[PDB]
Amino acid sequence: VSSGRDLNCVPEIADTLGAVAKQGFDFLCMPVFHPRFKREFIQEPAKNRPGPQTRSDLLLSGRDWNTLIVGKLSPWIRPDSKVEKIRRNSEAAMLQELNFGAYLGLPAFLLPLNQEDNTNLARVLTNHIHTGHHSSMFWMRVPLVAPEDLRDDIIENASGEEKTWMWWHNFRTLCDYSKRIAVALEIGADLPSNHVIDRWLGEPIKAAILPTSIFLTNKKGFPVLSKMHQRLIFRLLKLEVQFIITGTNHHSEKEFCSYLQYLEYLSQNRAYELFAKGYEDYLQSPLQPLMDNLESQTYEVFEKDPIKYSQYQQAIYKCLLDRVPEEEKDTNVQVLMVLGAGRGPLVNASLRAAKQADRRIKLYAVEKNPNAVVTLENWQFEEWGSQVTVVSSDMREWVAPEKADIIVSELLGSFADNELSPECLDGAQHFLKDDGVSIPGEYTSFLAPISSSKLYNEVRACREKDRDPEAQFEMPYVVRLHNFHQLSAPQPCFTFSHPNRDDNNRYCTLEFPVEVNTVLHGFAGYFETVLYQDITLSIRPETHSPGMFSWFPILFPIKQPITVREGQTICVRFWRCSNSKKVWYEWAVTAPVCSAIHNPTGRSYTIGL
């Protein structure tokens, strides 16, 4: 837990920062100008008010200002007022305060989203961001529940849950999805439903605001939280947000260290996550082992997965048991061909399987990488001996000296066929016997529609010079998506079975029933594969092989986000296209609104044959 204290009264700034640090908070949200010191910019005599307008810079050190203080906008500043004089004074004062915070080098700045119309606020913020050079972040302070819905029912004579998200959405759309504008979420006493909390979790939430009024009291008197509030705190702790404690100490018998100590307590009570840590929402580019030769480090990352190679060994074990009966054990030699042998973990899996199955095999290790052939041939000279024959050729152009009983390959990607497993295994099935087996036997890809505003900003930030300015939206990205929202369940896109005894071009139409109002940002792609009969490897988020981190999901972005409401169905078309030279994917959303066809002719992304 990194946590902050939100104060709106700072009499002395050094003493208050000291006391806040004594209580244990990491930063302090405070007003850079006095919250009640309303300023006039247009009308005399108050336009010419003398003296300093705020505190001196010199009251804290530079590093204190850049690392310890989160600024706040004054509450009287209403740039969207209906009175023109008020809104011009508020534009000028908001500019003045933002420029003073940029001058002080504050790391962040809190602005309030407490009403539906925030267009002039968005314009003044967007003009500040594009004026000068400054690097402060802007945390828009928006509640989970609008304040007119939290008010008590005590007035005698006087969109419900999706109100403030639409406030935030309109604001961030006006400001053009800036990297510098994020969310500070206020968690009140009354808590919305589960799907409202899911769109919110998909947002750039950099901080969470917990008033001391939402804390319950236990039998010993300390502050606690309800079970729904504890669940929300856990879901927010997954995102590594900073918690801001606001309000006064309602548990006056105890200290203000107790509200912080409860959050530390929840923090200390919350293999794939440890591997994927530091890679969350980091867009790689999918590997192309056929067109690019890999590195030693890439293969080393592959071979640190024991689950996948244990699964291949179990599949080869069961296939060897099936194809050779116990009475024909010592006279039948099974030709296995490991295609794309790598540095040799599949060959070792096959040898260990043939030991475990206690069957005799003659193995071929085919590999087109001339640098991994060095490793394979040192393996052959030292360990394997004459059992394994290392071939330095493409499996497609290699002329075998015999047919194969089993061919085993690991040519699968995050989308199961983006590394050209169909085309490689198609040219490698003519040296397979008519009752020969291919491991993996078949593989399917699965797609789900997702919303993730951070991922959309990451894809935008991938705009590279000297190419199409929007060609980054027409590439799949290998990404450990973390801060996202999955709109619907995955459905199967493409299936390839080997051997193919009967075209690798494919066309799929997937209709996803959405039950929630959302904003579609892309499609996340997973895969399943059947290696042998009951032996499977899956990266689907429900059937995921446990602790198996060989493959991250794949992400197909769309150029502009598509707003979706409840009861609609997202219809999307996916094509697997190819020619003699290249293979690519094309995608287009056709319902609720059409998008353009993404990557036509592979203009932004092909896989090289």
């Binding site: 591997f275 994927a276 790689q284 580019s285 999918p286 590997l287 990607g413």
Partner: peptide, 6 residues
Amino acid sequence: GRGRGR
């Protein structure tokens, strides 16, 4: 580079 990505 992790997860079949560069």
